Design a protein around this nucleic acid. Sequence first.
DNA 1: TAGCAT
Length: 178
Amino acid sequence: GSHMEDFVRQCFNPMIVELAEKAMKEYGEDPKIETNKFAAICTHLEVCFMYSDGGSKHRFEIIEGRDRIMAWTVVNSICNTTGVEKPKFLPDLYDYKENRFIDIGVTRREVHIYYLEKANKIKSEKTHIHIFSFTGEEMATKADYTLDEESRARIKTRLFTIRQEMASRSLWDSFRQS
DNA sequence: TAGCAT
Ligand SMILES: [Mn+2]
């Protein structure tokens, strides 16, 4: 029974917490033990949903948050109807305005470190990468940041708030260093 | 699978 687990459950809304729990269990893993992975998955979900709220109403197909089988089904429907390349790893959103998949990532390292790791470990060229840090930096493919500044700014604000909440509980050093 | 580790 870790502090980190009880922190996560009062920091994120129940719908995000339930989707996180399902994602770790769908891959046979324990929120109670892998508490840093629990917090990261909740963080990734919250950013993806905040990001999809930033568009015009029909702009994005949400992939993140669905059962894996249904996620790939929706990816195949997009690739078959748009002709866009089928990504190798499950993306987070599909941008109907710019006709591309987006993979969002959140990092406690310098933004470019995770960006470059993603820009290889995913290879599948045409997928747009958008990285956010817990210090208010972002980095996106071709410096194309997809949303208005206000929509990205509220994401950066929320991430710094998660950081301060973890730090005020002495969970940040453990989280940052794991 | 998240993303930090290696
Ligand atoms: Mn992602």
